[PDB]
C-alpha cells in the first residue's frame with residue numbers, strides 16, 4: 001500500500017470541499033492518506049517527502065497547492081493534478097505546462113467521475 | 123550583474139500592472155531582470171503553449187541569483203515557481219500586502235527561514251525602499 005499525499009486549497013468553496021472529501025475518501029481505497037506557519041510547512045513537507053503519489057485538486061488558485069506541487073516535482077514524486085473545467089477557471093500555464101503525461105499528469109474532470117478517474121490512475 | 127527573477131500572478135496582471143512595473147523598475151537598479159523580456163529565438167529553439175511557457179519560466183528560474191515573488195494574489199503558478207526555486211537553493215524574497223485583507227498561505231509564510239527565504243509584509247508606498255534595503 002502506497003503513502004498518498006492529498007492537496008487542495010485552504011480557501012476552496014462548498015463544491016471544492018465536498019470534492020476534496022470525495023477524493024480523500026477514494027484515495028483510502030488505495031493507501032494511507034498522509035494528509036505557527038513554520039511548523040505547518042515543516043510537517044507538510046515531511047509528509048510530502050514520504051509520499052508515493054501526490055494528488056492535487058488544482059481548480060482553485062492557491063499559492064500553497066502550487067508550492068507543494070513544485071516541491072513534489074523536485075522530490076521526484078509521481079503527481080496527479082485534477083482540474084474541473086466547469087468551474088469556468090483557466091488552469092495556470094505553470095501547472096498545465098508541467099505535465100509530461102507520465103510522472104506529472106493533469107486531468108480535466110467532471111465532478112461525477114472523480115472516483116472513476118482515481119480508480120483508472122491506480 | 124546579479125540575475126534577478128521576478129514573478130507575480132498572471133491573473134492580477136492588468137489590475138496590478140503598475141505595481142509589478144514599479145517592482146521590476148526598482149529591481150533593474152540592482153541586476154538584470156531576466157523575466158522582463160522573452161527573446162523569441164529562444165522560444166523557437168525549444169511542445170504546446172502551456173509547456174513552452176513552463177519550460178521558458180524554468181529556464182529563467184534556474185538562471186536566477188535572486189527570486190522576488192509578489193505573493194498577494196493566490197496563484198498556483200507563483201506557488202509552483204517558489205517550490206521549484208526552493209529546491210534549486212535560490213535566494214528568495216516574497217512580498218505580501220496585508221492591506222489586501224487576505225491571509226497569506228501558511229505554506230509560503232511557513233517557508234521563510236529568515237535568510238535564503240524571506241517573506242516581508244509591505245505597504246505599497248515603501249516597496250522601492252524595501253527593495254533597496256534587501257539589496258543593500
Ligand SMILES: CN(CCc1ccc(-c2ccccc2)cc1)c1nc(CN2CCc3ccc(C(=O)O)cc3C2)cs1
Pocket residue numbers: 006007008009010011012020035040044062063064065068227228229
Ligand atoms: C483536504 N485538504 C485541502 C483543504 C485543506 C485543509 C487543511 C489545510 C491546512 C491548513 C493549515 C494547517 C493544516 C492544514 C489546508 C487545506 C488538504 N490539503 C492538504 C495539504 N496542504 C496542507 C497545508 C496547506 C496550507 C495552505 C494551503 C493553501 O491553499 O494556501 C494549502 C495547504 C494544503 C492536506 S489535507
Ligand SMILES: CN(CCc1ccc(-c2ccccc2)cc1)c1nc(CN2CCc3ccc(C(=O)O)cc3C2)cs1
Pocket residue numbers: 092093094128129130131132133135142157158160175179197198199200
Ligand atoms: C510581471 N510578472 C507577473 C505577471 C505576469 C507576466 C507575464 C507572465 C508570462 C506568461 C507567459 C509567458 C511569459 C510570461 C505571467 C505573469 C511576471 N511573472 C513572471 C514569471 N512567471 C511567468 C509565467 C507564469 C505563468 C502563470 C502564472 C500564474 O499566476 O498562474 C505566473 C507566471 C509567472 C515573469 S514576468
